[PDB]
């Protein structure tokens, strides 16, 4: 009963967030085992951020120039390296609160949980998705850099995101914990376009099955449709094409609800073609798409 | 840059959530110092929930009939009592992870953070508000009972809510950690109406100032208005009347934005009187009202 944008419980990840200070720049880092991950532009200066040669900058730097503070206790840096666009600071201590963790690289449409941080101190948590153009619509201010995205399968925290920068368009970009940017984005202050953002078609169909479970059934109709016909409508409107894989994913939701997936697609088409007429589906005058089929089952 | 429904970081409260089993009924509890709080209908049975005499039931029960499990470790109950609609189980141990905490009773419109639990294990976290009719629109399934609502001022966790029941209308009701229900609700399965739910007028004005900070300024106009005239419009539409207190609260947001509060009210009236014409304010085709003026400053 009820449906909300829930976020994974953030306890495990709070215990890994540290402050990382280089020169005058300060930003958050992730402390797992005896290594501290943080964005590499920590080492950039005002002038260098137009186009930095990170090798040149990383080279003039030494371990004592990196100041890592775990809450109110300083860690000793004894090794530094650069994997893609992240710094990896070896430290003398192993975090006693290291959970079971993993570094996964996720796919556009998958949702994760963000623990927004400033000076290594938790501030808030929220759920969001990886847009198909590999940007995210988050909540980030100066110092938010280094904040992590993560999923918790049970006792294992799968880290998928590290925040780096806002684009001039107010959208954010980041890397995986190996340092690979999601998208065609680089960590220099130069012209970078986001690209065409479509809707996560499968996540909307998952969010509609959630509504039939919770009482909102007004959007249902007596029509049906073909996979091909729907996508033609999902192209006029900018919707990610729906595939057979996507239909198998939604199978569990169809068996619960007794509604063929292609019958849900038929109602989505009418919602696209005719709008909502000022109505509401779980308190949203817009069709939400940041709920994965798995999310809806997780939350039931 | 960006604005989202953030929730307080949930680490501190996760460490207080325990499982509480009585008879066949199981539900979550809150373990602070050497006491375990949980809803009292833990002691009810199928038949008794029509109208239970909690004294009668509480009386036939003894300390060993209450089973408290902190994760995977059992606590010994050595005292039981009933404060309003909550059970208070004295235990031999004092939770090593008790934070600085407080029991506040909040007012309709104030927002808090929920840590939804089942069998005393965190599942997810989300932000929500106390509707003016003292109900909440949350995310709760069977076993969600005992989950807590809380605000974190800095290092002090102010507990304000404990979940008890869903109403037949899909809305939830709860108590404060002293056991007083928010609203005219009782903990028996009988006819209880929610009441007229209005919109938190001040929280919308706080959410509109947030939009001017983040780039969405299309809803602004060259009009003004009087406090009285607006409320007349806030009565036709079901909006909590706006008071001078409410205007002083929004003062900080007006000094940041250079927009008189009564000029924001003038745009809200047009948004009410003329709708949004399919537009968007921070990605919401509806006027959101679960952001307190303080929330918007917290998140900036
Ligand atoms: C010195 N310094 C800097 C930062 C810091 C750096 C950045 C930042 C980092 C890199 Cl590599 C950039 F290429 C960059 O240009 C992105 C860009 C490209 C093209 C047009 C416009 C733009 Cl904006 C920006 C940032 O985006 N943010 C931020 C701010 C607000 C919300 N989210 C992220 C913050 C910091 O946190 N601490 C600290 O000391
Ligand atoms: C045996 N038993 C029972 C519960 C349990 C009890 C309740 C519950 C508790 C009390 Cl005092 C009630 F007066 C009650 O009638 C509310 C009502 C009144 C009038 C018309 C309809 C209704 Cl529904 C309900 C519940 O509402 N929920 C729940 C379920 C789904 C989401 N949220 C809350 C769960 C439990 O958790 N564990 C366990 O073992």
UniProtKB/Swiss-Prot annotation, chains A, B:
Q: Which reaction does it catalyse?
A: TSAVLQ-|-SGFRK-NH2 and SGVTFQ-|-GKFKK the two peptides corresponding to the two self-cleavage sites of the SARS 3C-like proteinase are the two most reactive peptide substrates. The enzyme exhibits a strong preference for substrates containing Gln at P1 position and Leu at P2 position
Note the position of the cross-link Glycyl lysine isopeptide (Lys-Gly) (interchain with G-Cter in ubiquitin): 5, 90
Q: Mutating residue 49 to A leads to what result?
A: Does not affect ability to cleave and inactivate human TRMT1
Q: How is its activity regulated?
A: Inhibited by pyridone-containing alpha-ketoamides compounds 13a and 13b. In turn, alpha-ketoamide 13b (tert-butyl (1-((S)-1-(((S)-4-(benzylamino)-3,4-dioxo-1-((S)-2-oxopyrrolidin-3-yl)butan-2-yl)amino)-3-cyclopropyl-1-oxopropan-2-yl)-2-oxo-1,2-dihydropyridin-3-yl)carbamate) inhibits SARS-CoV-2 replication in human lung cells. Inhibited ex vivo by michael acceptor inhibitor N3. Inhibited ex vivo by compound 11a and 11b.
The record lists the effect of residue 90 to R as: In strain: Beta/B.1.351
Consequence the record notes for mutating residue 132 to H: In strain: Omicron/BA.1, Omicron/BA.2, Omicron/BA.2.12.1, Omicron/BA.2.75, Omicron/BA.4, Omicron/BA.5, Omicron/BQ.1.1, Omicron/XBB.1.5, Omicron/EG.5.1
- Cytoplasmic side of the membrane: what ranges? 1-300
Q: Where in the cell is it found?
A: Host cytoplasm; Host Golgi apparatus; Host nucleus
Q: Where is the signal peptide?
A: none
Q: Which residues form the active site?
A: 41 (for 3cl-pro activity), 145 (nucleophile)
> Which residue range or ranges hold the Peptidase C30 domain?
1-300
User: Assembly and partners?
Assistant: 3CL-PRO exists as monomer and homodimer. Only the homodimer shows catalytic activity. Interacts with host FBXO22; this interaction promotes the proteasomal degradation of nsp5.
Quote the function comment for this protein.
Cleaves the C-terminus of replicase polyprotein at 11 sites. Recognizes substrates containing the core sequence [ILMVF]-Q-|-[SGACN]. Cleaves and inactivates human TRMT1, preventing tRNA guanine(26)-dimethylation of tRNAs. May cleave human NLRP1 in lung epithelial cells, thereby activating the NLRP1 inflammasome pathway. May cleave human GSDMD, triggering alternative GSDME-mediated epithelial cell death upon activation of the NLRP1 inflammasome, which may enhance the release interleukins 1B, 6, 16 and 18. Also able to bind an ADP-ribose-1''-phosphate (ADRP).
Record protein name field:
3C-like proteinase nsp5
Q: What is the lineage of its organism?
A: Viruses, Riboviria, Orthornavirae, Pisuviricota, Pisoniviricetes
Could you tell me the gene encoding this protein?
Answer: rep
């Amino acid at each position: 009963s009820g449906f909300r944008k829930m976020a994974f419980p953030s306890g495990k990840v709070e215990g890994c967030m540290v402050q990382v200070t280089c020169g005058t720049t300060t930003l958050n880092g992730l402390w797992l085992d005896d290594v501290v991950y943080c964005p590499r532009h920590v080492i950039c200066t005002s002038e260098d951020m137009l186009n930095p040669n990170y090798e040149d900058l990383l080279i003039r730097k030494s371990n004592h120039n990196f100041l890592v503070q775990a809450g109110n206790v300083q860690l000793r840096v004894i090794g530094h390296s650069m994997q893609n666009c992240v710094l990896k600071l070896k430290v003398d201590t192993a975090n006693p609160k290291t959970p079971k963790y993993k570094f996964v690289r996720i796919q556009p449409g998958q949702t994760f949980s963000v623990l927004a941080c400033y000076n290594g101190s938790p501030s808030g948590v929220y759920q969001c998705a990886m847009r198909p153009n590999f940007t995210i619509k988050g909540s980030f201010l100066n110092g938010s850099c280094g904040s992590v995205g993560f999923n918790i399968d049970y006792d294992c925290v799968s880290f998928c995101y590290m925040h780096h920068m806002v684009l001039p368009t107010g959208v954010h970009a980041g890397t995986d914990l190996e340092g690979n940017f999601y998208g065609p984005f680089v960590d220099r202050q130069t012209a970078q376009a986001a690209g065409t953002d479509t809707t996560i078609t499968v996540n909307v169909l998952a969010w509609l099955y959630a509504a039939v479970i919770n009482g909102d059934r007004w959007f249902l109709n007596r029509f049906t449709t073909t996979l091909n016909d729907f996508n033609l409508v999902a192209m006029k409107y900018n919707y990610e094409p729906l595939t057979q894989d996507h239909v198998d994913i939604l199978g569990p939701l169809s068996a619960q609800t007794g509604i063929a997936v292609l019958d849900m697609c038929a109602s989505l088409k009418e919602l696209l073609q005719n709008g909502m007429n000022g109505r509401t589906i779980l308190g949203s005058a817009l069709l939400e798409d940041e709920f994965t089929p798995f999310d809806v089952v997780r939350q039931c």
